[PDB]
Design a protein around this ligand. Structure first.
Ligand SMILES: Nc1ncnc2c1ncn2[C@@H]1O[C@H](COP(=O)(O)OP(=O)(O)OP(=O)(O)O)[C@@H](O)[C@H]1O
Ligand SMILES: Nc1ncnc2c1ncn2[C@@H]1O[C@H](COP(=O)(O)OP(=O)(O)OP(=O)(O)O)[C@@H](O)[C@H]1O
Ligand SMILES: [Mg+2]
Ligand SMILES: [Mg+2]
Lengths: 73, 73
């Protein structure tokens, strides 16, 4: 139940071997994530600073509890 | 005319101050580039390895002489 990475279409596009597992392509942790209760503005600032479109939201124990995208803004 | 970086729409999407110069926003050198005579296959392989959409092509002296994009493929 712990977050160990993320896989997006920029990774999958630049990958040819379809039979590959996710573990060989994904961006492995530590990811750019945020904690519960983060304001929208701070999440937007983090997405702007790190030039990413997805921000996993995790709890106190590292369990994934949400996902914020810049597409929603 | 010596190449000192690249600025793309992701960089300018994540800078709110519209009066900023390029030097403050651009991804600075050394960039992922390639030399003249690189085949489309090696250029595509580099773009796939480094998860970027653009590839400056420079000559033997570091001067920019082309630009290869994944959108063309
Ligand atoms: N939270 C994160 N922390 C670290 N890297 C991340 C995070 N989210 C995404 N990335 C990485 O950022 C890169 C770009 O992925 P992103 O999802 O931002 O673009 P995309 O939706 O694939 O883009 P496009 O719309 O151009 O196809 C990928 O290598 C991805 O693994
Ligand atoms: N050749 C390169 N070397 C290093 N960094 C680069 C290179 N080309 C682009 N970048 C940087 O990589 C990031 C993504 O740029 P890229 O042009 O690949 O995507 P984009 O066209 O802005 O994305 P999107 O289509 O999702 O809006 C930006 O921060 C950009 O400055
Ligand atoms: Mg996009
Ligand atoms: Mg794109």
């Amino acid at each position: 139940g712990e977050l160990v990475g993320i896989i997006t279409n920029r990774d999958m596009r630049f990958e040819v071997d379809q039979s590959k597992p996710v573990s060989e392509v994904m961006t492995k942790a530590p990811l750019i994530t945020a904690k519960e209760g983060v304001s929208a503005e701070a999440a937007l600032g983090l997405l702007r600073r790190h030039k990413i479109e997805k921000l996993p939201i995790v709890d106190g124990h590292g369990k994934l509890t949400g996902l914020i995208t810049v597409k929603d803004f």
